[PDB]
PDB file of C-alpha atoms in Angstrom:
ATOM      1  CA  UNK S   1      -9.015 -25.573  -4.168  1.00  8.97           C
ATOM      2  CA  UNK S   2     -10.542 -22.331  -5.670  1.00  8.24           C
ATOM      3  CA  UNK S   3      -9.793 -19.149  -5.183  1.00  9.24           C
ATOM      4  CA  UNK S   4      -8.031 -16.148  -6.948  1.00  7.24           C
ATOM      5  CA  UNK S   5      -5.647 -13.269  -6.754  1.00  9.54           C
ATOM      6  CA  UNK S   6      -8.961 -11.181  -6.413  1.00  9.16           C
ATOM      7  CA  UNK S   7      -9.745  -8.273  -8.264  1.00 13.12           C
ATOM      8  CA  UNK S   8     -12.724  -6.688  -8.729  1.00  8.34           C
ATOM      9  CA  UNK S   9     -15.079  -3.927 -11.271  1.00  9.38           C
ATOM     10  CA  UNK S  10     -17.579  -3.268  -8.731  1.00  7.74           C
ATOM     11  CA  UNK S  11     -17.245  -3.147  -4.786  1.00  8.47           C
ATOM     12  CA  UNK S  12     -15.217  -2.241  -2.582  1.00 10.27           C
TER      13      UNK S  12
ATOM     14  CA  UNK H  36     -17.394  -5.715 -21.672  1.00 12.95           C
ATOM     15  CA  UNK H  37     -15.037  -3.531 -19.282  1.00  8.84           C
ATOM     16  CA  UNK H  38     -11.818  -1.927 -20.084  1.00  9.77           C
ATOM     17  CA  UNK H  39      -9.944  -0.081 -17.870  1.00 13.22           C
ATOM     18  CA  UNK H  40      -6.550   0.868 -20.056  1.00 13.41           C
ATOM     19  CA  UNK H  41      -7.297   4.826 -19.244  1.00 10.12           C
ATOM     20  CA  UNK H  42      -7.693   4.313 -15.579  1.00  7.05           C
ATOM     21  CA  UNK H  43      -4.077   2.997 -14.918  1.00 10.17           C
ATOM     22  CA  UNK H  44      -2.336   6.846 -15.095  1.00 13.24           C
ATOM     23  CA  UNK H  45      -2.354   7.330 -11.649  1.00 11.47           C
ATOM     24  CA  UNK H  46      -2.469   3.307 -10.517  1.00 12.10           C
ATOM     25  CA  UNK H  47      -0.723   0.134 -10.569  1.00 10.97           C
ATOM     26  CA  UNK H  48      -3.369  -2.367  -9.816  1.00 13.12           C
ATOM     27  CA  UNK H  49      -6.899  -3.305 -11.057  1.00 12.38           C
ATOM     28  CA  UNK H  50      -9.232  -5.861 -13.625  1.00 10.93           C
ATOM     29  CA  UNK H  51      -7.498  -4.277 -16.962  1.00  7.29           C
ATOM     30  CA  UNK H  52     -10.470  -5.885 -18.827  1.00  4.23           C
ATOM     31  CA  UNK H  53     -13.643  -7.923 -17.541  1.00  3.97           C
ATOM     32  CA  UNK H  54     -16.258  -9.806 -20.085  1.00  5.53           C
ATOM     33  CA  UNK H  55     -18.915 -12.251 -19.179  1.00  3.83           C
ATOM     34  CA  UNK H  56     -16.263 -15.069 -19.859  1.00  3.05           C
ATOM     35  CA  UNK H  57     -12.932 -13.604 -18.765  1.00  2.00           C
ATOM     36  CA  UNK H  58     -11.610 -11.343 -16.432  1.00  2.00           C
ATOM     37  CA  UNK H  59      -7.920  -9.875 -17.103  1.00  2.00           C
ATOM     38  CA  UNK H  60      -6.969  -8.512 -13.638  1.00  2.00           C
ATOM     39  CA  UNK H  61      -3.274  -6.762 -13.659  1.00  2.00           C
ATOM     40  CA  UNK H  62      -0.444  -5.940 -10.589  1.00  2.00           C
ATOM     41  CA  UNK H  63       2.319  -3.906 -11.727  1.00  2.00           C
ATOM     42  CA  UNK H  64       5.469  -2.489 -10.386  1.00  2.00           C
ATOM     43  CA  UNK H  65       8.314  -0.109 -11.527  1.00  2.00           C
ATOM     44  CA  UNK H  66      11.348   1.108 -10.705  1.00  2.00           C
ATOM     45  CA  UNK H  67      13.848   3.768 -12.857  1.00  2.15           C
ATOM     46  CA  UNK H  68      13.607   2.543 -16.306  1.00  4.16           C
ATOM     47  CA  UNK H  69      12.107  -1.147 -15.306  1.00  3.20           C
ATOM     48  CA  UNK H  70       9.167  -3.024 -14.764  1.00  4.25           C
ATOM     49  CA  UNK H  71       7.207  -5.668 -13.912  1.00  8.52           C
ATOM     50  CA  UNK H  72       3.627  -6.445 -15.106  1.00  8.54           C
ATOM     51  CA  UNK H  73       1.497  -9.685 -13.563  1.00  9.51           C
ATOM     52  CA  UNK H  74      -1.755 -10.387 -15.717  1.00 11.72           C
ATOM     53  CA  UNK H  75      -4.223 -12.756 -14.275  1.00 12.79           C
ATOM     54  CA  UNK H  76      -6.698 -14.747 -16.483  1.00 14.96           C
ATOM     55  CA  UNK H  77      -9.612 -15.601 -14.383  1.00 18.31           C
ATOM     56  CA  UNK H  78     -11.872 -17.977 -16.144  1.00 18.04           C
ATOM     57  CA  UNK H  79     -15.597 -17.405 -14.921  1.00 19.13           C
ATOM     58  CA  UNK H  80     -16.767 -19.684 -16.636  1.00 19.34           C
ATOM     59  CA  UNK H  81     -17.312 -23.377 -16.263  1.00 19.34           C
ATOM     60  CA  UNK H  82     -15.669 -24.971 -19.375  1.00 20.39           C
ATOM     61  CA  UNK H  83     -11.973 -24.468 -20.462  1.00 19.97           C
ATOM     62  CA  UNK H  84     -10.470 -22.061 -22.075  1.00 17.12           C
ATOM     63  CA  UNK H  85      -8.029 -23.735 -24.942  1.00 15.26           C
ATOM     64  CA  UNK H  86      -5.167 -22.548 -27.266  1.00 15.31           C
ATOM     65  CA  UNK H  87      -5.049 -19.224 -25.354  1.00 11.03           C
ATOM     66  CA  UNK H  88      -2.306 -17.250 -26.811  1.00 13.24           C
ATOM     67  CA  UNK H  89      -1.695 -13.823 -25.637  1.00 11.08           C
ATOM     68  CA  UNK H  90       0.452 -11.644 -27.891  1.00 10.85           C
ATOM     69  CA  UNK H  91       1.886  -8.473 -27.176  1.00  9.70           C
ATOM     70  CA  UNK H  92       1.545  -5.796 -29.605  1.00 11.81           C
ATOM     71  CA  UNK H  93       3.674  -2.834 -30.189  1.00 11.24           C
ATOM     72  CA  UNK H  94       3.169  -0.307 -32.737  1.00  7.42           C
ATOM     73  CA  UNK H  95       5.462   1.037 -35.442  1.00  6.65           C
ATOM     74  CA  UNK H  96       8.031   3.291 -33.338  1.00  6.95           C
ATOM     75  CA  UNK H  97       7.148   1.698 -29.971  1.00  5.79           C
ATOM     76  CA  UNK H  98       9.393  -0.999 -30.414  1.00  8.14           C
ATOM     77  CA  UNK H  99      12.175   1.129 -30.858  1.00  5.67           C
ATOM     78  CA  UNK H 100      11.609   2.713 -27.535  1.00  7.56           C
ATOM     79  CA  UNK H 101       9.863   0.080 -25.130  1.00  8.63           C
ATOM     80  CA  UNK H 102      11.212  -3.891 -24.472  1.00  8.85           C
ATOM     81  CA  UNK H 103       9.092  -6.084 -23.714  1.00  8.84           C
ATOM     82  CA  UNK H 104       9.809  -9.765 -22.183  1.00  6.78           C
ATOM     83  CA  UNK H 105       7.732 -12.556 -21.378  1.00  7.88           C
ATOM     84  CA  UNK H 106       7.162 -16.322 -21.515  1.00  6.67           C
ATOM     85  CA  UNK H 107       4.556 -18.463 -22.823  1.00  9.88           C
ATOM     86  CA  UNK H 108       1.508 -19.456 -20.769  1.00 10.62           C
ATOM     87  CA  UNK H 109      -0.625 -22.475 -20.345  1.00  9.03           C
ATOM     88  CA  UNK H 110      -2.583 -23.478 -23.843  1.00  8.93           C
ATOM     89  CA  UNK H 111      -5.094 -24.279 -21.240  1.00 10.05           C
ATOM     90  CA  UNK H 112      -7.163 -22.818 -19.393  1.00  9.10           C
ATOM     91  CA  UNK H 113      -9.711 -24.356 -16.420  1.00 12.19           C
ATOM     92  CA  UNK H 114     -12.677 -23.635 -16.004  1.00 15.66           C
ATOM     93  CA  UNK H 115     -12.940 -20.906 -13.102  1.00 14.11           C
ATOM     94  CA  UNK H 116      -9.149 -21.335 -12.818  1.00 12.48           C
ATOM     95  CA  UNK H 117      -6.987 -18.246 -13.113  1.00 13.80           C
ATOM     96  CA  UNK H 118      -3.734 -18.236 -14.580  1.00 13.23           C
ATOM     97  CA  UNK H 119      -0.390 -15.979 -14.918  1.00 13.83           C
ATOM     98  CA  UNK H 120       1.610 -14.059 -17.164  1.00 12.39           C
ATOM     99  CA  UNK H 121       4.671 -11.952 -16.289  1.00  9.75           C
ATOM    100  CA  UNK H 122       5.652  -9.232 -18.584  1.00  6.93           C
ATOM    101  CA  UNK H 123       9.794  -7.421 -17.619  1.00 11.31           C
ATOM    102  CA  UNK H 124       9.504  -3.923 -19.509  1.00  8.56           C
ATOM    103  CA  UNK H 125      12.690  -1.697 -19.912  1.00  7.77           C
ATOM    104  CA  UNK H 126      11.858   1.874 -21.144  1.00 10.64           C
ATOM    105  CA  UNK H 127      14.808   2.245 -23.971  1.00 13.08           C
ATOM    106  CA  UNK H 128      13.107   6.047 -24.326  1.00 11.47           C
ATOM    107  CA  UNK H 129       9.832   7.980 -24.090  1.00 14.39           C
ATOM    108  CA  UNK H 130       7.020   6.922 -26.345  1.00 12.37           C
ATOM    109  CA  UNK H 131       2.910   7.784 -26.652  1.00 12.71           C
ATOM    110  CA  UNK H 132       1.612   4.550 -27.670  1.00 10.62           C
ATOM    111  CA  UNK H 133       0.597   1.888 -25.437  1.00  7.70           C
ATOM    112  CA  UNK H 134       1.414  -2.130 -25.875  1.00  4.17           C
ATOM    113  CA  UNK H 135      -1.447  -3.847 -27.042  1.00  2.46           C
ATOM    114  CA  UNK H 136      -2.576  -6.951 -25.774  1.00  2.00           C
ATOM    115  CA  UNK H 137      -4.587  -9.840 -27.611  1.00  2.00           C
ATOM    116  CA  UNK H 138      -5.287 -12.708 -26.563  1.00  2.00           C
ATOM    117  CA  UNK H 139      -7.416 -15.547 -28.790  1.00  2.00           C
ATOM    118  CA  UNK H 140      -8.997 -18.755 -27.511  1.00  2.00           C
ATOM    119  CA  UNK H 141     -11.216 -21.969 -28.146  1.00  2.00           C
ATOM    120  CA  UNK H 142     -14.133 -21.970 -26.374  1.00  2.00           C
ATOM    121  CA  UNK H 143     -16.732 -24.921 -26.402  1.00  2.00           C
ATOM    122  CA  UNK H 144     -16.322 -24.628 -30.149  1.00  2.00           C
ATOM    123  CA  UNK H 145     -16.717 -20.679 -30.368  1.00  2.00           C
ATOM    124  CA  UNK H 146     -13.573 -18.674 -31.081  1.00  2.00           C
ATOM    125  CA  UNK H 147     -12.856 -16.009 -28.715  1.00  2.00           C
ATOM    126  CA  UNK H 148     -10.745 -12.646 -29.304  1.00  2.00           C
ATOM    127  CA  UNK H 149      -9.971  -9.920 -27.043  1.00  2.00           C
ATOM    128  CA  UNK H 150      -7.827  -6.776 -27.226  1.00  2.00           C
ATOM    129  CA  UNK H 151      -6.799  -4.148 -24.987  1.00  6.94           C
ATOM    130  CA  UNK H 152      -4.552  -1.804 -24.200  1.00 10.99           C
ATOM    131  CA  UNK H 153      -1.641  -2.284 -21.563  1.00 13.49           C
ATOM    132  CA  UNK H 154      -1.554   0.471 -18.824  1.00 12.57           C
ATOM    133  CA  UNK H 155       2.241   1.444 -19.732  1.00 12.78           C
ATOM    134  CA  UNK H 156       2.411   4.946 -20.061  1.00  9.79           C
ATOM    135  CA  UNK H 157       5.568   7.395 -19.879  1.00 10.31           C
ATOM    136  CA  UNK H 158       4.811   8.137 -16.328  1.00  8.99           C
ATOM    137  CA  UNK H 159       5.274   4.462 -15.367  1.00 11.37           C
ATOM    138  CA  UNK H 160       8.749   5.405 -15.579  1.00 12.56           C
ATOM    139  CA  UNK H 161       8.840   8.823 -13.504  1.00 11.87           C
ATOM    140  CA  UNK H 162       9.933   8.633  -9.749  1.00  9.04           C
ATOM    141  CA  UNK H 163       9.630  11.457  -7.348  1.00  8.95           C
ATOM    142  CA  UNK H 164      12.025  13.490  -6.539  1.00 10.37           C
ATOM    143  CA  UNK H 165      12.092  16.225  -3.204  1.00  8.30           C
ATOM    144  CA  UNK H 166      13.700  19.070  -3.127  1.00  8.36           C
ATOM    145  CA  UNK H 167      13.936  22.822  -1.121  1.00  7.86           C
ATOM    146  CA  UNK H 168      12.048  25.636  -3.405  1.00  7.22           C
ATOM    147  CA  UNK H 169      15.018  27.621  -3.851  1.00  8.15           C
ATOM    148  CA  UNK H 170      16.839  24.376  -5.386  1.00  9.09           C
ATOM    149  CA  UNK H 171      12.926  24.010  -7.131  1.00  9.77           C
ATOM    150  CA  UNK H 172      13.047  27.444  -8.309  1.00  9.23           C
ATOM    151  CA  UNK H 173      17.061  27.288 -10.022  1.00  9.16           C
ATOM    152  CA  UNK H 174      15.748  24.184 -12.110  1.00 11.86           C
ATOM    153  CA  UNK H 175      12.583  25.707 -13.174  1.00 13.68           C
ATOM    154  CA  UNK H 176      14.654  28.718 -14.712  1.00 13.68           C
ATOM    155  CA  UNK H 177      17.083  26.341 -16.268  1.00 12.12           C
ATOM    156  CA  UNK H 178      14.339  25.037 -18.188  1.00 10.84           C
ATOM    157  CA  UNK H 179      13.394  28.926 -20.083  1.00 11.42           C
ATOM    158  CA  UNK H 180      13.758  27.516 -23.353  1.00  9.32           C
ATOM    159  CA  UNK H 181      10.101  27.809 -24.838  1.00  9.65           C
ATOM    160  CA  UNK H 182      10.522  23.862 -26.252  1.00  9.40           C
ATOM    161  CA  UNK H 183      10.920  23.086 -23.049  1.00  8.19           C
ATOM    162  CA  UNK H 184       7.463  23.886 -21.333  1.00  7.79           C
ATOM    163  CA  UNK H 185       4.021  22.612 -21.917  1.00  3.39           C
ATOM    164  CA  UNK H 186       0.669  24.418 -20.580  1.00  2.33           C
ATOM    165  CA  UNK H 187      -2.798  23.297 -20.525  1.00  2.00           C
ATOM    166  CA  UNK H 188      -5.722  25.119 -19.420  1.00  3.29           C
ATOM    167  CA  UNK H 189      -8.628  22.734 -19.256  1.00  2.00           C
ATOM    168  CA  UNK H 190     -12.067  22.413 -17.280  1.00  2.00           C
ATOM    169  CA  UNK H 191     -11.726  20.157 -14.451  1.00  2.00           C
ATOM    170  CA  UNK H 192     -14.040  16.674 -15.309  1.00  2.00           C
ATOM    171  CA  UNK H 193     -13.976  15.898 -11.613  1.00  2.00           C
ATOM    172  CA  UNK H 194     -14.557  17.825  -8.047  1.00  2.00           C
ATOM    173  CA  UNK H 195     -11.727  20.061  -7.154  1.00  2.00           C
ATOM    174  CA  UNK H 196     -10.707  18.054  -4.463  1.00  2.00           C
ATOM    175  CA  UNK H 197      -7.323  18.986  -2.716  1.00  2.00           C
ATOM    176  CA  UNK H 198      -6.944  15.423  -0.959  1.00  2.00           C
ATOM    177  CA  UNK H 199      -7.791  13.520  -3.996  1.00  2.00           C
ATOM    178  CA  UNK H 200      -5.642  15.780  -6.480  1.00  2.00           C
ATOM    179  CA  UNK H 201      -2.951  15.648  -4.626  1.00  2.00           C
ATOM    180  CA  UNK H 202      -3.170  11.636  -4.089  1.00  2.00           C
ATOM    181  CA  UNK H 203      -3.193  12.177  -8.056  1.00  2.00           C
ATOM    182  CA  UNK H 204       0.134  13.657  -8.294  1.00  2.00           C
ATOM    183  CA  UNK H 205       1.510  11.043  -5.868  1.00  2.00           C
ATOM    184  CA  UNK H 206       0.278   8.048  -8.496  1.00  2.00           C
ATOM    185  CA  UNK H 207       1.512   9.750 -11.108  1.00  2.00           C
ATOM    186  CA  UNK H 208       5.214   9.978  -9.960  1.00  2.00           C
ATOM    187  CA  UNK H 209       5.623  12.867  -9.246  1.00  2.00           C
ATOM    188  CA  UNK H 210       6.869  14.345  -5.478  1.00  2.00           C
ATOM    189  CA  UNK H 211       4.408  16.566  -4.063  1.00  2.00           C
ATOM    190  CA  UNK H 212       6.273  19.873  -3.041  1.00  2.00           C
ATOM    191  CA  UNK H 213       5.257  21.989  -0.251  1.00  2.00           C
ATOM    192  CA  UNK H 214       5.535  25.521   0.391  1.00  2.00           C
ATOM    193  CA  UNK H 215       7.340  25.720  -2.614  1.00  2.00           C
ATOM    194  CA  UNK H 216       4.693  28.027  -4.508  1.00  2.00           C
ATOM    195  CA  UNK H 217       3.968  31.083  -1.860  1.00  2.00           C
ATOM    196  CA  UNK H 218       0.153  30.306  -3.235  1.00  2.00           C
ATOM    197  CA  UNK H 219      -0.750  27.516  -0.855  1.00  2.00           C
ATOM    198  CA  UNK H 220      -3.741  26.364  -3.305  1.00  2.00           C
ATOM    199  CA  UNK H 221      -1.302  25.411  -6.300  1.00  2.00           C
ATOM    200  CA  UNK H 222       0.444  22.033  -6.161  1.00  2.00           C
ATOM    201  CA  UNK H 223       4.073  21.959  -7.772  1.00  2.00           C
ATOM    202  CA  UNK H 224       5.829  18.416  -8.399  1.00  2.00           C
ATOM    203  CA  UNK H 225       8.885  17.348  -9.153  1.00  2.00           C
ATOM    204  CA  UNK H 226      10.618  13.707 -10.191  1.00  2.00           C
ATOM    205  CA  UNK H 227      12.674  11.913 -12.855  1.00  2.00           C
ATOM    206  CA  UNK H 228      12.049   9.701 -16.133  1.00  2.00           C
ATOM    207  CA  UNK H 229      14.163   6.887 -16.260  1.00  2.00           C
ATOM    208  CA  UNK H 230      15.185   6.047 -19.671  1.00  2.00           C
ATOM    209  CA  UNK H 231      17.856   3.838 -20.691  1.00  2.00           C
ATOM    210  CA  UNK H 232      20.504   6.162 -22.068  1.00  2.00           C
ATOM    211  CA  UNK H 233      18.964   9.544 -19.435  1.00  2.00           C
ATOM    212  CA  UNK H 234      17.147  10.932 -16.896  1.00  2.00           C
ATOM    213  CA  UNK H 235      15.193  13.161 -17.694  1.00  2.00           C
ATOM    214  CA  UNK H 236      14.409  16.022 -14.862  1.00  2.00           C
ATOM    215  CA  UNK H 237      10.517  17.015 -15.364  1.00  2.00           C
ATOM    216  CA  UNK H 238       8.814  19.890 -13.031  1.00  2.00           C
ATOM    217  CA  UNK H 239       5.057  20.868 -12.649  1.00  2.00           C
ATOM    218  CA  UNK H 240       2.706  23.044 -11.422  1.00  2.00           C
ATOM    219  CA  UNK H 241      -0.744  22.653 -11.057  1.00  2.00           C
ATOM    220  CA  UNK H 242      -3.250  26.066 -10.408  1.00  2.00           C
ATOM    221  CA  UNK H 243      -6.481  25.095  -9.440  1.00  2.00           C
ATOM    222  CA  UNK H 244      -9.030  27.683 -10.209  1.00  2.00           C
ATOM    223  CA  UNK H 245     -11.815  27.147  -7.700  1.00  2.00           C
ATOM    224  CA  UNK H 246     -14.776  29.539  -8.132  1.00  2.00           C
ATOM    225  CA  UNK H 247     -14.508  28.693 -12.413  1.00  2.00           C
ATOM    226  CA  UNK H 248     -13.858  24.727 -11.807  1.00  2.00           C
ATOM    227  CA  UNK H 249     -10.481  25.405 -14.095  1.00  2.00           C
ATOM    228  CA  UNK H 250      -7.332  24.478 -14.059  1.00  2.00           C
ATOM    229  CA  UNK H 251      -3.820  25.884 -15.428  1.00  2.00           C
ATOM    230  CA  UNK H 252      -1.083  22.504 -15.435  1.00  2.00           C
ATOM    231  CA  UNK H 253       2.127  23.116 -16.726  1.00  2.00           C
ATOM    232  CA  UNK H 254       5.071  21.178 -17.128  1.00  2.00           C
ATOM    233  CA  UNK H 255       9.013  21.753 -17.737  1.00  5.21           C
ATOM    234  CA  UNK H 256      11.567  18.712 -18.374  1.00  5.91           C
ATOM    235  CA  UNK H 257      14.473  19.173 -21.120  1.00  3.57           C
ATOM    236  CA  UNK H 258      12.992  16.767 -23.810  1.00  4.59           C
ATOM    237  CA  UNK H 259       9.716  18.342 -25.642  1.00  3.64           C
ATOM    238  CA  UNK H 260       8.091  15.248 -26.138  1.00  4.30           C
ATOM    239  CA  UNK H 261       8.207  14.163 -22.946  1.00  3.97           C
ATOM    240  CA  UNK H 262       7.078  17.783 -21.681  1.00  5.10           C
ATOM    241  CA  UNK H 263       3.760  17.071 -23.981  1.00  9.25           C
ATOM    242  CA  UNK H 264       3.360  13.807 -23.032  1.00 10.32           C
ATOM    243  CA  UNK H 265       3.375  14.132 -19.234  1.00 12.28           C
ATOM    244  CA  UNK H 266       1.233  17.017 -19.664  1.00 11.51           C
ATOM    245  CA  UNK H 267      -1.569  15.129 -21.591  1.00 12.13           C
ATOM    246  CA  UNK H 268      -1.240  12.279 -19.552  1.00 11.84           C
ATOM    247  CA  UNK H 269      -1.385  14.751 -16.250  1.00 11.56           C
ATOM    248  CA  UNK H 270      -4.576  16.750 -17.296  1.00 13.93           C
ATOM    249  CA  UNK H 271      -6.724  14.066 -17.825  1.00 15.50           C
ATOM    250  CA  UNK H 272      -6.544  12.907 -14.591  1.00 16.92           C
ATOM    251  CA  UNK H 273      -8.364  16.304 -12.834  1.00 17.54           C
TER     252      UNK H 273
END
């Protein structure tokens, strides 16, 4: 167990 | 802190608002006068987040004019656990101001409060709509009444990029039309606001001036406000 619905303010 | 409210015209998806302790991340859909709005409260830290109680805001007339739905989320939050909220909006009729959300929460003993902005904007609501210039050209001249139409001449604040404007138009709502203006540099678009009680036909052209780094944007629907609205929602995008 972990992860997220990722999002992201940097990179791409 | 990060807070992307203003970069949601032309977009669905994104972080809404990032801090050193939370990250608000946001997937939204829409169709006529609906929608649906997932927030995501990512936890980066490593102790919970408790009592967190997001409230939706809406200011004087916005009420009036934009429904808002939702149910109640987990008091608790884990650390570097990310949880869900879903938001059903119904446009009732156009509006300027934007829902605000706030959320407040324990932290390790320190009270936390955030605000921002909710990316729902009149455009949200506007679905693209093709059509043959001639058919283009009839509506346009159905809309001569001078309450009608809304111009803006403004400097461009990014690189007059035909791929990337018209990508723009696209995430606005609007239906890119081609070979519709004889100029093949302009861009004309053409869609509908949903609204509970109309649709609302809205038009647009868009006259890049190259060599100056200008452009003219103007746009015709049948309601004034949402003429001006559109259009100050539009030009800030170029």
């Amino acid at each position: 167990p972990n992860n997220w619905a990722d999002f992201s303010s940097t990179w791409p | 802190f990060e807070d992307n409210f203003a970069r949601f015209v032309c977009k669905n998806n994104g972080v809404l608002f990032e801090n050193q302790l939370l990250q608000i991340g946001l997937k939204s859909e829409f169709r006529q006068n609906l929608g649906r709005m997932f927030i995501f409260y990512g936890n980066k830290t490593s102790t919970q987040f408790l009592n967190f109680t997001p409230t939706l805001i809406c200011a004087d007339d916005l009420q009036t004019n934009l429904n808002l739905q939702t149910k109640p989320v987990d008091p608790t939050v884990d650390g570097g656990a990310q949880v869900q909220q879903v938001v059903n909006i119904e446009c009732i009729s156009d509006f300027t101001e934007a829902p605000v959300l706030n959320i407040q929460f324990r932290y390790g003993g320190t009270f936390q409060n955030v605000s921002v902005k909710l990316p729902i904007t009149l455009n949200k609501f506007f679905q693209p709509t093709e059509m043959a210039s001639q058919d283009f050209f009839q509506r346009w001249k159905q809309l001569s009444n001078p309450q009608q139409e809304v111009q803006n001449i403004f400097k461009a604040k990014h690189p007059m990029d035909t791929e990337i404007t018209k990508a723009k138009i696209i995430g606005f709502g609007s239906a890119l039309l081609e070979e519709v203006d004889p100029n093949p540099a302009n861009f004309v678009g053409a869609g509908i606001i949903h609204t509970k009680t109309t649709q609302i036909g809205c038009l647009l052209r868009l006259e890049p001036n190259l060599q100056a780094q200008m452009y003219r944007l103007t746009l015709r629907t049948s309601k004034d406000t949402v003429s001006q609205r559109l259009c100050e929602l539009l030009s800030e995008q170029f």
